[model samples]
Target chain A: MKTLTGADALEFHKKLKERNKALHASDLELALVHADAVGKERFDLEELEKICDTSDAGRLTDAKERNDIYERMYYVEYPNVMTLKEFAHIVETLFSWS
Target chain B: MKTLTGADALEFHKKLKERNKALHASDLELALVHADAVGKERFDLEELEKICDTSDAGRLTDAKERNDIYERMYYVEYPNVMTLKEFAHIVETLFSWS
Candidate 1:
């Protein structure tokens, strides 16, 4: 499996933040807007997982396949944001990365 | 297409935070590091998207093609972070959402 490197991770976070800023004008503000609207005062990881699981247009049957698409695309964009070490920590904390 | 609701938006943030905490130990601090390395302190959407377009191992022969892949992957992961409204705002502000 292709692993994320530190440079790649750093690039990924940079991209993600940029995306967040451009997309939302204010990432923190919009994040709060969504959080309050959803009744969550703050953020959580499993919540994201649930959203992915529930929001799939091709839900259930395509879970793994969809997740694979998620994984690949994630890595591709992953290089746009966080560091590999950070990403690895996220994987260990939030994913079944083994 | 699965449009994200306010509730979905909240879920995405929760997950993003969890992912950040687990992975980076400190989102703001780590974000600063990566940003500085890339010679930026804040963030920009175009930069993020460019990183996506450029860093593809699958490169130019499939530039537009890779973009399509990016769009889909982006939406999937998009819902995993910001809201549909926020997503739409991002598309409009950063992307040429016409």
Candidate 2:
């Protein structure tokens, strides 16, 4: 399998940022709207990070959480807020946060 | 929210194929082994497509199945068998397969 870490992950993030612009303020608004519609209004960032860590740890046993994490990671947070590099960094941080 | 469909999805597949080489036969062997290890030996392609459709339809309520589908799609099948485009095509097919 291909492993991306440290600098490589950072480089990938750079490329991703170059290809995809930073999330717009309007996008964030839409994200909030979606979050409300999906009953994710109370889903905090810490909870999200906890979910990310659980998923990374391979201990996540819920399908809804898994899908929610996937959706939030790729669709919500990443699309409306962070770059891939930033997301990767958060993942790395969560990996060691435990 | 970038929606890829039809020609765009095919184009993405073409690009993915150009960038990421086809999965090696050995990778397929590994995938089979992993499937066996995960007790997914009898998981049929139709079953997988069903899970995929359920996921796409926003009706999947199981986390393990969700994780399994995500893993099989991105890690197992895609790594050892198909490109993003092919996977996306399968997803599209499954979307209509129901």
Candidate 3:
């Protein structure tokens, strides 16, 4: 069984930060607009929410998978609703890391 | 053929940054002194460099694998030789982001 060393975490962090700093996050979020690097497919929140809003037995898996971006917005980006820096600063304090 | 979306990049960045911010780079570099989380071993640069100082066929594998931390310091930690913030601040400008 393999184990992690203390350095492993930071190594991972540095590599990731370099990748991100190389490719800004806000730009990547536009994949939904400009489209995919390959043909794997992608979607935005409003589209995903509309797919899930009327939840169905057949569309259940569809909703969950499509919800990837919704989850992405919740965890990765601050949400399209909070794009305004002024607005984001106001809301940033409202949410706790907890 | 799988393709990457913009959101994928940011999602990757967010997850990686969160993990790093939680763990911190300076602390993780201590794996060489204290030990491993599992059975995977680790090392430090001085130790790795010392091992590599006098190269040998038998020691080559040892150097490369051990060099993990040496490489870690070079790419990940920005080299231990630059720890002094005053020194680092000066050197920071010396290195080009380009």
| Maximum-lDDT candidate | 2
Q: Per-residue lDDT of A1-98 in model 3, one digit per residue for the tens?
A: 34444676666566556545534444444433233333323334554444233233345467566455344544335323323332334334443333
lDDT of 1 by residue, A1-98 (tens): 23335876766677667555444333443444443443432233344454334233344456566554434333433433233333434444444432
Reference-based lDDT, residue A56, model 1: 33
lDDT of 3 by residue, B1-98 (tens): 24445776666566556545534443444432223333233334454434234233355567566455344543345423323332334334443342
lDDT at position A83, candidate 3: 30
Stretches of model 2 off by over 4 angstroms after superposition:
A1-98, B1-29, B32-56, B73-82
Q: How well is candidate 3 docked (DockQ)?
A: 0.08
Better of 2 and 3 by TM-score: 3
As a whole number from 0 to 100, the lDDT of residue A96 in candidate 1 is: 44
Candidate 2 scores an fnat of 0.00
Q: TM-score each candidate.
A: 0.17, 0.21, 0.24
The TM-score that candidate 2 achieves is 0.21
lDDT of 2 at A29: 40
Model 3 C-alpha lDDT versus the unseen true structure? 0.42
DockQ winner between candidates 2 and 3: 3
DockQ, ranked from best to worst: 3, 1, 2
Residues A1-98 of candidate 2 have per-residue lDDT tens digits of: 45556655565556445333323323434554444443343434444555345465578768677656654554455544433434546666656855
B20-93: candidate 1 lDDT, tens digit per residue:
44443233444444434444323333444543333333444555664544344334334233323344445444
What is the i-RMS of every prediction?
Answer: 10.8, 13.9, 10.6
